[PDB]
Each structure stands twice: as structure tokens, then as C-alpha cells.
A paper describes a structure:
CjDsbA1 crystallized in the C2 and P212121 space group containing two monomers in the ASU for the monoclinic form and one molecule per ASU for the orthorhombic form, while CjDsbA2 crystallized in P3221 with a single chain in the ASU. The superposition of monoclinic and orthorhombic forms of CjDsbA1 showed relatively small differences between them, which was confirmed by an RMSD value of 0.45 Å. The active site of CjDsbA1 was observed in the reduced form, while the CjDsbA2 formed a clear disulfide bond. This was due to differences in protein purification procedures. In contrast, CjDsbA1 complemented a lack of EcDsbA in an EcDsbB-dependent manner. CjDsbA1 in E. coli was partially oxidized, probably due to sulfonic acid, and generated oligomeric forms (resolved by CjDsbB) that are active in disulfide generation.
The bacterial proteins of the Dsb family catalyze the formation of disulfide bridges between cysteine residues that stabilize protein structures and ensure their proper functioning. The oxidative part of this network consists of two monomeric DsbAs (DsbA1 and DsbA2) related to EcDsbL, which cooperate with one DsbB.
Author numbering: 3 to 193
The structure:
Amino acid sequence: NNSFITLNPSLPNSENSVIEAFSYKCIHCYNHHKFGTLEKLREAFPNLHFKLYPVSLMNGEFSKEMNELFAFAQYKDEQNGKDASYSDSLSHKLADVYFVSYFLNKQRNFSNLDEFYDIGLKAMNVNKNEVLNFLNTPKAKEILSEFQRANDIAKTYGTPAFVVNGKYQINPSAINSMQDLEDLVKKLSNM
């Protein structure tokens, strides 16, 4: 069958989930963001959680700081009843501003971190110190550790990469359509 590979070990804190490993510099990731792929999967599968895993080796010079901002967004979205499948989540808004920066606003280079960091902080209506205080917590360090698996996940087939229940990574060649992706997420989430 080869429609998926099994990750070993499983991704932590992944049960009942679809994880999308993505880059803000990837056209395919941008197209899935604009299309609302994760929102559509929530329409089909309201009991699954949807999470973004940024791929730091594809996210350029300020990739570590981008991972920090996504860890904060993931944290805060849990406090607010949202995940990455809601357009008004902090995770979706944060992905949106960086996709807009790169694909609409032609920004490739920043001469220092704070020009880059400020885009994310403005999208989430927070400041650098609020993010720094969150980063200095065991739970933030745990979320950032989880994102380290995104790099090898992305290398297998490219981005985006969809992972079901922390275990089953979908081969992009196995699907043509949104409904093909839904059907495979159903099969894998019921294994």
C-alpha cells in the first residue's frame, strides 16, 4: 500500500491529531493555507486536533525565533478553544503574516531579528517579553523539542507533510484531491 510511512517513535502529545509540517517559504504550504485544508479536515473530523509543526531548516535565518513564536501560538490557542484549523487561531494568523511577508510583500531578508520577530508579535498582539516569559517554562521547552522532529519529517517527501495520530505520515504521491486526503486521514486515524 505505501500511501503512508509509520514514524518510530510516535510523535509525543499527538493522539487524536493531524500535524502539518510546513515552511512559510513553501508554495505548496501557502496553497494549503489559502485553500483551508486543515479547516476542511476539521469539518470531516471534529474530534481531531490540528497542529502546525514549522520546519526550521526550511525557514531560513530566523527559524529558531519562528519556532518560538509558533510554540507561543500553540500554547495560547489551547487557552482560547482554538487550533490551527481555525482561521482566527494565533497559529493560523502567525502562519498567515509570514506567508504574506514572503509571497505578497517580497520580504526575503531582515538585517536583524526584531524586524522579523515584530511581524509575528504584531499578528498575535503580544510583545517580545511576554513570549520570553513563556519560553522560560518547561512546557514551552517541551513544545519546541516536539518541533525538532519536523526537519526529518519534511526531508522524506517534502512539504507540507501531514501526520495522523503522531504515527502515520501521508505520502503526498498517494493523494490527488482534498477528498483523497480526507479518506486517508479517516483510514489512518481508525488504525
